[PDB]
Amino acid sequence: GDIVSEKKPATEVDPTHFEKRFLKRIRDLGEGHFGKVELCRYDPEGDNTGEQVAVKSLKPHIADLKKEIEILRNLYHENIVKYKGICTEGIKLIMEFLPSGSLKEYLPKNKNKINLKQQLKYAVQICKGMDYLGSRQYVHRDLAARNVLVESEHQVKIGDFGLTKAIETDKEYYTVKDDRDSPVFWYAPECLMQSKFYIASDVWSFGVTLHELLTYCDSDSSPMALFLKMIGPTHGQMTVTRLVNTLKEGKRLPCPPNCPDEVYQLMRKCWEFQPSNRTSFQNLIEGFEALLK
Ligand SMILES: CC(C)(C)OC(=O)N[C@@H]1CC[C@@H](n2cnc3cnc4[nH]ccc4c32)C1
Fold first, then answer.
1. Last residue in a domain, options 58, 74, 97
2. Ligand 1 neighbourhood includes 262 CB (under 6 angstroms)
3. Are residues 158 and 250 in the same domain?
4. Does 117 belong to an annotated binding site?
5. Ligand 1 mean position to 18 CA, how many Å?
6. Whether 66 contacts 91, CB under 8 Å
7. DSSP SS3 for 282
8. Is 2 a catalytic site residue?
9. Helix (H), strand (E) at residue 148
10. Which listed residue (142, 160, 202, 220) is catalytic?
């Protein structure tokens, strides 16, 4: 008889599957030693009217990216960047694009627009996103101004989850093995000394991110710049031990210029040497809110 073929079933569009052929690169948003985030237009009509998206890929680590995708896909919060979908065969993560970029890009350019009150409002939003993440039993491990995105003058979102780990139920912390490219000038002593990551360790990192926000991410006042002044900039592989010693001695980043002492004191509560002595994200929120009203 006739050639037998397969009955074509009723195909449905998945709005979270982005086809490689319509995903068109515009420029880079960031990169590291294993990957990049690129600005693309998803342009199925081919007339440059498609939606702009942020696309996270790997350089020619897959498993970690798949885990990152699965974490972000299931986070829903107004201060966490929106998952849009994936592009696959290898995999790419597709996210909403925030044209203002990170606080590192935005703050140096917008000092006149963004006063202390707005900085404190950003600080609360960062804290709300982080408290949501902790409520889902995650530790972020990479909270820094470069990973905080600006949705508008009035709203920020946590914009990267590449190091985020689940803390096991009934456990207080996650222990990391892969630690080469750690952001050590953002890390709490327990992270540095033992590679143990608590929710309290994210509070510590928040305090450093707050210091960045308050300095408008000026490079000459960055956590790295200031610590290297405190400890010495030419110690190579002794850097972390000298960082740890400085922190053991009770030395901390200084009060930013024009930062009220009452804001600096909330910051210091993030930097208690022992995790259990640190403030919580909820208490930070309360504290900033008291300063705002
Ligand atoms: C280092 C690595 C390539 C792994 O990741 C990043 O560079 N991540 C940065 C965090 C925010 C990213 N970014 C910068 N401008 C952005 C604008 N919109 C964005 N949506 C999702 C991420 C994102 C943006 C880049």
1. 97
2. no
3. yes
4. no
5. 19
6. yes
7. helix
8. no
9. strand 148-152
10. 142
